[PDB]
Amino acid sequence: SQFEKQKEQGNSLFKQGLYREAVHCYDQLITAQPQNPVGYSNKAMALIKLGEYTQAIQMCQQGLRYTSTAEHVAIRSKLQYRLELAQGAVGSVQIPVVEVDELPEGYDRS
Amino acid sequence: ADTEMEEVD
């Protein structure tokens, strides 16, 4: 059994840019220890760098279900960081595709 | 750097 390597191998894939490929090994941290925060913490930090903040917000608040111990205080600190920036970015767009240059929203001709 | 927030574990 292991957890560390699946957390140390993607530990550079995420830092390179391969965020999803990095999570693609992080996801086994949660499947091996679905009651462990760093599982969610690794997969979560990558979702910000992918901009799937929507999912990132879910990962961080999940980690806090397991931080009942001081081996997890490290991550309890993160489940509060990228938890906040994600939900403050998920859909934050003050310049979306909202333009009109043609007919009414419900014209008729017959 | 200035973070552990942008590190994994």
Curated annotation (Swiss-Prot), chain A:
Modified residues (N-acetylserine): 1
UniProt xrefs under PANTHER family: RNA POLYMERASE II-ASSOCIATED PROTEIN 3
Pfam families: TPR_19
Gene that this polypeptide is encoded by: TAH1
Organism: Saccharomyces cerevisiae (strain ATCC 204508 / S288c) (Baker's yeast)
Predominant location: cytoplasm
Protein name, entry field: TPR repeat-containing protein associated with Hsp90
Subunit structure: Component of the R2TP complex composed at least of RVB1, RVB2, TAH1 and PIH1. Also interacts with HSP90.
The UniProt record lists the keyword Disulfide bond: no
UniProt-recorded Gene Ontology molecular function terms: protein-folding chaperone binding
Keywords linked to the UniProt accession: Acetylation, Cytoplasm, Nucleus, Repeat, TPR repeat
CC terms in the record's Gene Ontology section: cytoplasm; nucleus; R2TP complex
Keyword Iron: no
From Swiss-Prot, chain B:
Motif segment (TPR repeat-binding): 5-9
Source organism, top-level taxon: Eukaryota
Subcellular location: Cytoplasm
Reported induction: Expressed constitutively and induced by high temperatures dependent on transcription factor HSF1. According to PubMed:2674684, it is constitutively expressed at low levels, however, due to the specificity of the antibody, this result is unsure.
Residue stretches of biased makeup (Acidic residues): 1-9
Comment field (misc): Present with 444943 molecules/cell in log phase SD medium.
UniProt remark on domains: The TPR repeat-binding motif mediates interaction with TPR repeat-containing proteins like the co-chaperones AHA1, CDC37, CNS1, CPR6, CPR7, HCH1, SBA1, SSE1 and STI1. CNS1, CPR6, CPR7 and STI1.
Quaternary structure, from the entry: Homodimer. Interacts with the co-chaperones AHA1, CDC37, CNS1, CPR6, CPR7, HCH1, SBA1, SSE1 and STI1. CNS1, CPR6, CPR7 and STI1. Interacts directly with the substrates GCN2, HAP1 and STE11.
Role description: Molecular chaperone that promotes the maturation, structural maintenance and proper regulation of specific target proteins involved in cell cycle control and signal transduction. Undergoes a functional cycle that is linked to its ATPase activity. The nucleotide-free form of the dimer is found in an open conformation in which the N-termini are not dimerized and the complex is ready for client protein binding.
Family: Belongs to the heat shock protein 90 family.
Protein name per its UniProtKB record: ATP-dependent molecular chaperone HSP82
Organism: Saccharomyces cerevisiae (strain ATCC 204508 / S288c)
Lineage per the UniProt record: Eukaryota, Fungi, Dikarya, Ascomycota, Saccharomycotina
